[PDB]
Motif scaffolding. Structure first.
Motif, PDB file in Angstrom:
ATOM      1  N   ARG A 102     -41.984  20.555  -3.565  1.00  0.00           N
ATOM      2  CA  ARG A 102     -41.508  20.333  -4.958  1.00  0.00           C
ATOM      3  C   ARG A 102     -42.704  20.336  -5.916  1.00  0.00           C
ATOM      4  NH1 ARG A 102     -36.918  22.152  -4.244  1.00  0.00           N
ATOM      5  NH2 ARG A 102     -36.706  21.612  -6.457  1.00  0.00           N
ATOM      6  N   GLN A 106     -42.629  23.977  -5.387  1.00  0.00           N
ATOM      7  CA  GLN A 106     -41.699  24.470  -6.438  1.00  0.00           C
ATOM      8  C   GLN A 106     -42.391  24.443  -7.802  1.00  0.00           C
ATOM      9  OE1 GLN A 106     -39.255  25.843  -5.276  1.00  0.00           O
ATOM     10  NE2 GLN A 106     -38.826  24.844  -3.321  1.00  0.00           N
ATOM     11  N   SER A 107     -42.813  23.263  -8.267  1.00  0.00           N
ATOM     12  CA  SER A 107     -43.394  23.175  -9.602  1.00  0.00           C
ATOM     13  C   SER A 107     -44.575  24.125  -9.758  1.00  0.00           C
ATOM     14  CB  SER A 107     -43.817  21.737  -9.902  1.00  0.00           C
ATOM     15  OG  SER A 107     -44.749  21.695 -10.970  1.00  0.00           O
ATOM     16  N   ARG A 109     -45.210  26.770  -7.920  1.00  0.00           N
ATOM     17  CA  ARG A 109     -44.676  28.125  -7.835  1.00  0.00           C
ATOM     18  C   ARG A 109     -44.131  28.576  -9.183  1.00  0.00           C
ATOM     19  NH1 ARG A 109     -39.341  28.904  -8.912  1.00  0.00           N
ATOM     20  NH2 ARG A 109     -39.172  26.912  -7.794  1.00  0.00           N
ATOM     21  N   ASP A 110     -43.330  27.722  -9.823  1.00  0.00           N
ATOM     22  CA  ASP A 110     -42.744  28.077 -11.110  1.00  0.00           C
ATOM     23  C   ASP A 110     -43.827  28.269 -12.163  1.00  0.00           C
ATOM     24  OD1 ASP A 110     -41.156  28.494 -13.312  1.00  0.00           O
ATOM     25  OD2 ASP A 110     -40.065  26.600 -13.174  1.00  0.00           O
TER      26      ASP A 110
ATOM     27  N   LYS C  30     -41.893  34.972  -0.445  1.00  0.00           N
ATOM     28  CA  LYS C  30     -40.695  34.187  -0.706  1.00  0.00           C
ATOM     29  C   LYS C  30     -39.457  34.841  -0.104  1.00  0.00           C
ATOM     30  CE  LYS C  30     -40.578  32.590  -5.007  1.00  0.00           C
ATOM     31  NZ  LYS C  30     -40.559  32.932  -6.454  1.00  0.00           N
ATOM     32  N   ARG C 141     -31.313  27.055 -12.889  1.00  0.00           N
ATOM     33  CA  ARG C 141     -32.527  26.474 -12.254  1.00  0.00           C
ATOM     34  C   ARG C 141     -32.340  26.447 -10.734  1.00  0.00           C
ATOM     35  NH1 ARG C 141     -36.806  27.412 -14.364  1.00  0.00           N
ATOM     36  NH2 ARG C 141     -37.536  26.084 -12.650  1.00  0.00           N
ATOM     37  N   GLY C 143     -33.574  27.200  -7.102  1.00  0.00           N
ATOM     38  CA  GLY C 143     -34.856  27.475  -6.421  1.00  0.00           C
ATOM     39  C   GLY C 143     -34.687  28.435  -5.257  1.00  0.00           C
ATOM     40  N   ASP C 144     -35.798  28.960  -4.729  1.00  0.00           N
ATOM     41  CA  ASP C 144     -35.740  29.904  -3.581  1.00  0.00           C
ATOM     42  C   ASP C 144     -34.951  29.239  -2.450  1.00  0.00           C
ATOM     43  OD1 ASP C 144     -36.140  31.657  -1.468  1.00  0.00           O
ATOM     44  OD2 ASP C 144     -38.330  31.720  -1.644  1.00  0.00           O
ATOM     45  N   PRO C 146     -32.440  26.258  -2.296  1.00  0.00           N
ATOM     46  CA  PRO C 146     -31.650  25.155  -2.798  1.00  0.00           C
ATOM     47  C   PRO C 146     -30.974  24.478  -1.608  1.00  0.00           C
ATOM     48  CG  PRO C 146     -30.412  27.193  -2.925  1.00  0.00           C
ATOM     49  CD  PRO C 146     -31.787  27.559  -2.415  1.00  0.00           C
TER      50      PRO C 146
END
Lengths: 130, 128, 285
Positions: A102, A106-107, A109-110, C30, C141, C143-144, C146
Motif C-alpha cells: 500500500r 500502491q501509493s 506505484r501511483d 504488473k 480507484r 488497484g492492480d 483489489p
C-alpha cells in the motif's frame, strides 16, 4: 488424514492434511473426521479450530462455507484470520502490509506512474512543433 | 480589467497540455479551460472592425466577471457583436460614462459598476 | 529546422521514448503479477463452480429456484457491469469495451428492455456520465490487485436488484485476455442459472445442514460476486497487457521519429557549416 483446504477469494490459506476440524456450522458446531459423510454447510462468525497431531490452531473465520467429501474438506471461507499469532501485526503480514504494501506497493506505484504520465504529457506539448 | 484576462489566458495555455490528452480532469479544471476558451474566442476579431476603448473595456468586464460563462463558445463572438449593438442602441450613456472616467485610479467605480452590470443583465434576458 | 531546434526535438522525443520504455517495463511487471493473482484466485472459483453444478443438479424446482436462479420472463429491466481501466494509455481496450457496452445497451434497448449500467473504473464512469448513462453504480480507484470486498459495493446492489425485481438480468462487460498481445472485450451473464452437463456435477450428494434453500440463497450471491471478482482481475491483467503493447508500439514509433529527426538534424548541420564557410570565404575574398 483428510485433505483440508482453507481457500479464499484472494488466496489459498492451507492445503495440508488434518486430524480434526472443529467447524462452526450455522446450526451448530460440527466436528469432522477422515471419513465424514458428504456435507455442505454455512459457517457463522466464529473461531474454526484445526487439530493437527494434538496442536490446536484457532483460525478465526468471519464467515464462509464448507464442503466435506469423504476424502477431502474445502472451506470457502470469506475471511480467515489467525489471532493466535498475535505478533501478526508486528509481523510483515500486517507490519509490511502497512509499509512494504500500500505505502510503496500502491501509493508509490501511483505516484511514479502518474509522474511518468505527467512528464510525457508536458513533453508532448513541448514537442508540438514538429 | 486586463490583468485577469492575461492571467487566465496564460493559465489556459498552461493547462492546454492536460486539455489535449486528459479527459478525467476535475470540474475546476474543466471550468478553467472553458473560461480560457471563452477568452480566446473573445479575441477573434474580424477585419476592418476596430473597437474603441470603452467597447473593449465593457466586453472584457463582461467576460472576466463571469457574465459570459453560460454562452457557448461558437456564439461568443456573435454575442460580443450583438452586445455592442445593444450598447449602441439601448444605452449609449453607459459607453459615454465608461469613456469619460477611464483614467481614474480605480475604474470599477460604484457608479460605473452599476448601469453596466445592469446593462449586461438586461442584454442577457433579451437575447437567449 | 535551424539545426538547434531539431536538437530540442530529438531530446524531447528521446525523453518520450525513455518514459514510454519505463512504463512498458512496469506494465509488463504488473501484468505478470495480475496473472499470478488470477492464477491464485482460480481454485476458489473452480471449487464453487462444481458446487454450483452439484447443487443445481438438485433443487431444480422453479419455485425453489425463484431466488436469483430464476429467469425473469419479462426482462423489462437489464443491467450491465462494465469494468474499464481507470487510467488511459491502455490502447484500444478502453474503447473496444465501451463500444461493446453500446452494441449491448442498444441491442438490448432495442428489445424494449431498460438497459442500466454499473461501472468499475473512472474511464467507464465518464463515457457514460457523458453519454448520459450515469452509472447506476461506479467503483473507481481500482488497484492492480483489489480484494473481492471492493466489487461487493456494486455487486451487492446489482444482486439486491435482481431480487428487488428492479432488474431481470445482469451482464458484465469486461476485457478478456487471450494472448499477451490480444485482449478481446467480452460479455458474460451474471444470472446464476448454472445447471451444466450432469456429467460436470457427477451429481455429488450432500446433507445440506441449514437446508437446500438456505444454502442456495446464501451461495448464489457469493457465486456472482466471485464471477465479478474474476472478471475484474482478468480485466486488470488485460489492461496491463494492453498498456504494455501500446507502450512498446509508442517506443518503436519514438525511435523511428528519433532516427528521422537525426537525419534532418545532420542535414541541417551540414547546411549550416556550408553556409558559414561560404560566407567566411566571401568576406575574406
Amino acid at each position: 488424514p483428510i485433505h483440508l483446504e482453507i481457500v479464499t477469494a484472494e488466496r489459498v490459506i492451507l492445503s495440508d492434511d488434518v486430524d480434526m476440524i472443529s467447524a462452526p456450522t450455522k446450526d451448530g458446531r460440527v466436528g469432522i473426521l477422515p471419513r465424514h459423510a458428504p456435507l455442505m454447510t454455512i459457517l457463522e462468525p466464529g473461531e474454526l479450530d484445526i487439530i493437527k497431531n494434538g496442536e490446536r490452531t484457532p483460525f478465526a473465520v468471519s464467515g464462509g462455507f464448507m464442503e466435506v467429501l469423504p476424502h477431502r474438506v474445502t472451506i470457502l471461507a470469506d475471511t480467515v484470520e489467525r489471532a493466535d499469532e498475535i505478533d501478526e501485526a508486528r509481523a510483515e503480514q500486517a507490519r509490511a502490509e502497512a509499509e512494504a504494501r500500500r505505502r510503496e506497493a500502491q501509493s508509490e506505484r501511483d505516484m511514479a506512474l502518474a509522474e511518468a504520465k505527467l512528464r510525457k504529457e508536458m513533453v508532448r506539448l513541448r514537442v508540438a512543433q514538429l | 480589467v486586463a490583468g485577469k484576462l492575461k492571467g487566465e489566458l496564460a493559465q489556459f495555455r498552461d493547462l492546454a497540455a492536460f486539455a489535449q490528452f486528459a479527459s478525467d480532469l476535475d470540474a475546476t479544471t474543466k471550468a478553467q479551460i472553458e473560461r480560457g476558451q471563452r477568452l480566446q474566442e473573445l479575441l477573434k476579431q474580424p477585419q476592418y472592425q476596430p473597437l474603441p476603448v470603452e467597447d473593449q473595456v465593457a466586453v472584457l468586464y463582461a467576460a472576466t466577471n463571469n457574465y459570459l460563462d453560460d454562452v457557448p463558445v461558437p456564439l461568443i463572438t456573435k454575442w460580443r457583436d450583438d452586445f455592442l449593438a445593444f450598447l449602441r442602441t439601448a444605452h449609449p450613456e453607459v459607453r459615454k460614462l465608461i469613456y469619460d472616467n477611464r483614467l481614474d485610479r480605480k475604474f470599477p467605480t460604484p457608479e460605473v459598476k452599476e448601469a453596466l452590470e445592469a446593462a449586461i443583465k438586461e442584454f442577457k434576458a433579451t437575447s437567449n | 529546422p535551424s539545426s538547434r531546434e531539431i536538437k530540442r526535438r530529438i531530446r524531447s522525443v528521446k525523453n518520450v521514448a525513455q518514459i514510454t520504455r519505463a512504463m512498458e517495463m512496469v506494465s509488463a511487471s504488473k501484468m505478470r503479477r495480475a496473472q499470478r493473482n488470477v492464477l491464485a484466485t482460480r481454485p476458489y472459483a473452480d471449487r464453487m463452480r462444481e458446487v454450483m453444478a452439484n447443487l443445481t443438479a438438485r433443487v431444480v424446482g422453479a419455485a425453489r429456484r425463484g431466488t436469483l436462479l430464476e429467469k425473469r420472463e419479462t426482462v423489462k429491466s437489464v443491467a450491465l457491469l462494465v469494468v474499464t481501466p481507470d487510467r488511459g494509455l491502455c490502447g484500444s481496450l478502453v474503447a473496444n469495451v465501451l463500444r461493446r457496452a453500446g452494441r449491448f445497451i442498444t441491442e438490448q434497448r432495442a428489445m424494449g428492455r431498460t438497459v442500466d449500467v454499473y461501472t468499475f473504473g473512472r474511464k467507464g464512469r465518464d463515457f457514460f456520465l457523458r453519454t448520459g448513462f450515469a452509472p447506476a453504480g461506479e467503483a473507481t480507484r481500482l488497484g492492480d490487485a483489489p480484494k473481492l470486498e471492493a466489487i461487493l459495493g456494486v455487486a451487492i446492489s446489482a444482486i439486491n436488484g435482481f431480487q428487488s425485481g428492479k432488474y431481470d438480468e445482469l451482464y458484465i462487460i469486461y476485457s478478456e485476455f487471450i494472448n499477451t498481445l490480444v485482449q478481446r472485450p467480452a460479455i458474460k451473464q451474471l444470472l446464476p442459472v448454472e445447471s451444466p452437463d450432469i456429467s460436470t456435477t457427477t451429481n455429488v450428494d450432500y446433507t445440506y445442514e441449514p437446508g437446500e434453500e438456505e444454502v442456495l440463497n446464501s451461495i448464489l450471491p457469493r457465486y456472482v460476486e466471485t464471477q465479478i471478482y474474476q472478471a475484474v482481475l482478468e480485466s486488470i491483467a488485460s489492461e496491463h497487457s494492453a498498456r504494455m503493447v501500446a507502450m512498446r508500439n509508442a517506443t518503436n514509433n519514438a525511435k523511428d521519429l528519433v532516427r528521422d529527426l537525426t537525419l534532418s538534424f545532420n542535414k541541417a548541420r551540414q547546411a549550416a557549416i556550408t553556409k558559414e564557410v561560404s560566407e567566411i570565404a566571401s568576406g575574406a575574398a
